[PDB]
Amino acid sequence: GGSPTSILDIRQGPKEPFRDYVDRFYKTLRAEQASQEVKNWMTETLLVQNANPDCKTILKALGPGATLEEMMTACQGVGGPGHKARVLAEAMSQVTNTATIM
Amino acid sequence: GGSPTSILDIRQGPKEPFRDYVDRFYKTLRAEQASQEVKNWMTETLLVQNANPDCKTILKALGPGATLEEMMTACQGVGGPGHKARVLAEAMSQVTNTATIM
Amino acid sequence: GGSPTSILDIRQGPKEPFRDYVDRFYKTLRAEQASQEVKNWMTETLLVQNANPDCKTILKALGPGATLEEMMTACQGVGGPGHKARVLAEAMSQVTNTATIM
Amino acid sequence: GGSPTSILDIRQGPKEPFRDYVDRFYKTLRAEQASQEVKNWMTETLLVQNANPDCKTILKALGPGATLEEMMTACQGVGGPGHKARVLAEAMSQVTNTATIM
Amino acid sequence: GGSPTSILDIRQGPKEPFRDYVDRFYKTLRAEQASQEVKNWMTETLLVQNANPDCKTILKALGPGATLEEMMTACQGVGGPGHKARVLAEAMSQVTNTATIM
Amino acid sequence: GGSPTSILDIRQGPKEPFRDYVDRFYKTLRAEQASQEVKNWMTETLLVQNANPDCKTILKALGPGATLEEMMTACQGVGGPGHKARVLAEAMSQVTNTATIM
Ligand SMILES: O=P(O)(O)O[C@H]1[C@H](OP(=O)(O)O)[C@@H](OP(=O)(O)O)[C@H](OP(=O)(O)O)[C@@H](OP(=O)(O)O)[C@H]1OP(=O)(O)O
Ligand SMILES: CC(C)(C)c1ccc([C@H](Cn2cccc(C(F)(F)F)c2=O)NC2Cc3ccccc3C2)cc1
């Protein structure tokens, strides 16, 4: 848990899909000198807390227990027309004062 | 699916079009050591399911039976002027006047 | 009909303009092993049909019979100016005030 | 006239600035086997006809006969911040309140 | 302090996440011949000063006293889909309804 | 000034930040066969004139006489989130209600 270059800071870019970054988690997990028990624990636990709020909001929202594959399906929505069209459509409609935050 | 690399997850990014990714689906199959029955099965089932929600929403809109050409013509507009044109407006114009979601 | 790499997939992108793709048409046709007329036939039937809804919506707009020299001229602002510009301001104003679709 | 690659298709892309294309007009022409007068005619004539609507229309704003430098001074804004802060950025608010086009 | 290529200008892009830039910051902080205190000192004071105003405002916002990790985690939310979603939502309506600036 | 490639056309792109271009300005100067004074004159007079309107509107605003460090800091915001958030947000809200230009 938190091996050199692997968990202490592996981080998904704001424009970096969950795809490359998660792989950065897998391949770097291969690149670290971790025990088996060491990597499996790293994956579930850190992968979420450190990855791009677009998807981090999806890892937590899916609700824990979501199969990794499902995290991928959900994070695949990360993206412009899919995830951004909603974050731009939503954030803009809250400031449209039927529901603006004061 | 599940064959090595080719069809476990072959994914379509948000900016990667349905066009370029098709090759990712097929050309990557050229790499898996799978029977033709194994591959053609993959071309259909794993394609629509693990590829780009802008397009998937179109693969299930066109629906099954759509030749790849049908999934091609419609998903061609995936992108800003074609799809984002219809995507920004759908969420923006919905939540604002009548489709406001509480 | 499309011989290998010729008219089966010569497809334009959603970010790629009629300038780059049009070249793909002719060039990849040089790599095809087809009859002379096949190439001339290929352009009229496939090009307009399997090419990027930006240039495709322009092409129909041109009205068939517009020389390739003319299609080039027409689809030049494809890409951010001609096309992506006109497109955002329209969808935004059609669905919103009068052309609102229920 | 236009010898192969020189003036028949030297064109400025859509996202492309007058900078990169002007370099092309100035690059490909060297590759042309034209007469000294012909080339002089080529810049003033073909540079404006086939140079990017962001910046082309600019050449119309400056207007014909302007010094090439001025063509650059006014076509420097083409591209994300300068040109676009002004054109569609305005079109968003034009078609909306007073400039609504039926 | 401030050695060549190290801190005299080590600067992050407008969009560059604090990570890519920092891969520079750290790598070059290690390449300059600075005393253990000189470098360490630089990693504190300069890291916040010469870095992408998006992330810089975040840095100040977290407030000093937060672990370095927090400085970059917060800046990991710098952004296209995430940070920009929040900023775009607010700026547009700030000026429009209450925060109108004359 | 006016030596080949150095100050006649050294230009900042539209998406290119004040950093990359300034670098073109400084590096290209090394290429010109100018007197030491000649280059100094060149950095002040031209750097502000043929450099990307975002930063150019900033350079004038800072006010001449500002150190290169001052042009650098102020123009670091050139870019999307920092400079575009403000430009679009303003133009959009100026044209709309009170600052509508006839
Ligand atoms: O012109 P294209 O090659 O089709 O791509 C552009 C370009 O993006 P790039 O940075 O990749 O060249 C714009 O960049 P600018 O030069 O305008 O900064 C970007 O602008 P933003 O970063 O501000 O979004 C714009 O998007 P838009 O037209 O929404 O301004 C995007 O076009 P696409 O999103 O349509 O691919
Ligand atoms: C607010 C700002 C970011 C500055 C802005 C505003 C709108 C434009 C464009 C309109 N416009 C403006 C200038 C130059 C061109 C070019 F170079 F691309 F031709 C052009 O198309 N229209 C986008 C095309 C497009 C594509 C995808 C999503 C939105 C838009 C609007 C670009 C930038």
Q: Show Cβ contacts of residue A35 under 8 Å, excluding neighbours closer than 6 positions.
A: none
Q: How far apart are CA F95 and CA D98, in angstroms?
A: 11
d(CA A29, CA A43): 9
**C81 close to ligand 1 (CB < 6 Angstrom):** no
What does DSSP assign to residue B50? H
How far apart, in Å, do the first and last CA atoms of chain D sit?
A: 42
DSSP track, D54-75? HHHHHHHHH-TT--HHHHHHHT
What's the burial of D97, exposed, middle or buried (CB within 10 Å: 0-12/13-18/19+)? Answer: exposed
Cα–Cα distance measured from residue D4 to residue A31, given in angstroms and rounded to the nearest whole number: 52
Distance of CA B38 to the CA centre of its chain: 20
Residues in chain A: 102
Q: Which of F36, F32, F23, F44 is nearest to F2 (CA)?
A: F32
Q: How many Å apart are CA B74 and CA B18, to the nearest integer?
A: 9
Q: Which two tokens stand for residue A82?
A: 């899919």
Q: Which of A101, C12, C44, F1 is nearest to B19 (CA)?
A: C12
Buried b (16+ CB within 10 A) or exposed e, F19-30: bebbebbeebbe
Nearest-CA residue for atom 27 of ligand 2: B80
What is the C-alpha to C-alpha distance for residues F87 and F58, in angstroms, rounded to an integer? 12
- Rounded-to-integer distance, Cα E4 and Cα E2, Å: 7
C80 touches ligand 1 (CB under 6 Å): yes
Residue with the two structure tokens 């599940």: B2
Give the nearest ligand 1 atom to A80 CA.
Answer: 34
Judge whether A98 is closer than 8 Å to chain B, CB to CB. Answer: yes
DSSP structure class, residue E14: S
Residue A36 half-sphere exposure toward CB, CA atoms < 13 A = 0
Between CA B54 and CA A77 the distance in angstroms is 8
* Contact between B79 and C15 using a beta-carbon 8 Å cutoff: yes
Contact E23, E64 (CB under 8 A): no
* A89 interaction partners in chain B (CB closer than 8 Å): 88, 90-92, 94-95
CA angle F80, C94, B59 (to 5 degrees): 75
Q: H helices of chain E, where?
A: 18-29, 36-49, 53-62, 68-75, 83-93
CB contact under 8 A, E77 and A11: no
**CB of residue F14 inside a 6 A radius of ligand 1:** yes
- For residue D37, the Cα-to-chain-centroid distance in whole angstroms is 22
Long-range contacts of B31-40 (CB under 8 A, 24+ apart): B31/B5, B31/B6, B32/B3, B32/B4, B32/B5, B32/B6, B32/B7, B33/B3, B33/B4, B34/B3, B34/B6, B34/B7, B38/B3
Distance CA E2, CA E32 (A): 9
- Would you call E81 an interface residue with chain A, using a CB distance cutoff of 8 Å? yes
CA distance F11 to D22: 12
For the Cβ of D89 lying below 6 angstroms from any atom of ligand 2, the answer is yes
Touch criterion met for D and E (3+ Cβ pairs within 8 Å) = no
CB-based burial of residue D4 (10 Å sphere; 0-12 exposed, 13-18 middle, 19+ buried)?
Answer: exposed
Q: How many CA atoms lie within 13 A of A94 on its CB side?
A: 14
Nearest to E95 among F81, F83, F93 (CB): F93
Q: Which residue of A has its CA nearest to B102?
A: A99
DSSP for E52-78, please give it: THHHHHHHHHH-TTS-HHHHHHHHTT-
Check if F84 has its Cβ closer than 6 Å to any atom of ligand 2: yes
Could you give the CA distance from residue F10 to residue D76 in angstroms, rounded to a whole number? 11
Ligand 1 contact, C79 CB (< 6 A): yes
Q: What six digits make up the tokens of C24? A: 């793909």
3-state DSSP helix/strand/coil % of chain B, to nearest 5: 60, 0, 35
Within 8 A of C77 by CB-CB distance, chain B residues are none
Closest CA to E88 of A101, A91, A57, C93: A91
Round to whole Å and give the CA distance between A79 and B79.
Answer: 11
Side chain identity, residue A84: K
Minimal Cβ distance to E79: which of A14, A80, A92:
A14
B83 touching A, CB under 8 A? yes
Q: CA-to-CA distance for E75 and E23, rounded, in angstroms?
A: 14
Please check whether residue F93 touches E, CB under 8 A.
yes
Stretch 14-43 of chain A: residues touching chain E, C-beta under 8 Å: 14-15
Distance CA D22, CA D10 (A): 9
Instruction: Give the chain D residue nearest F8 (alpha carbons).
Output: D69
Please, are residues F10 and F50 in contact by the beta-carbon 8 Å criterion? yes
Cα dist from A91 to A6, B67, B70, E91, F82, whole Å: 33, 38, 34, 11, 18
Cα distances (Å, whole numbers) of residue E32 to E20, E101, F23:
19, 46, 21
Is B33 exposed, middle or buried (CB count within 10 Å of its CB: 0-12, 13-18, 19+)?
Answer: exposed
- Strand partners for F12: F51
Q: Measured between CB atoms, does C52 come within 8 Å of chain B? A: yes
Tokens in use for A97? 């004062």
| Alpha carbon B75 to its chain's center | 7
Catalogue the long-range contacts made by C54-62 (C-beta closer than 8 Å, 24 or more residues apart). Answer: C54/B81, C54/B82, C54/C12, C54/C14, C54/C17, C54/C18, C54/C78, C54/C79, C54/C83, C54/C84, C55/C12, C55/C17, C55/C18, C55/C21, C58/C18, C58/C83
- What's the maximum distance between 2 C-alpha atoms anywhere in chain A? 54
Closest residue CA from atom 29 of ligand 1: B80
What's the gap in Å between C85 CA and the centre of ligand 1? 11
C82 lines ligand 2 (CB under 6 A): no
Q: Can you tell me the distance from the alpha carbon of B56 to that of B84, in angstroms, rounded to the nearest whole number? A: 15
Contact E7, E47 (CB under 8 A): no
Of residues A85, A79, A82, A89, the one with CA closest to residue A52? A79
Atom of ligand 2 nearest to the CA of B80: 27
Q: Residue C12 pairs with which residues in a beta bridge? A: C51
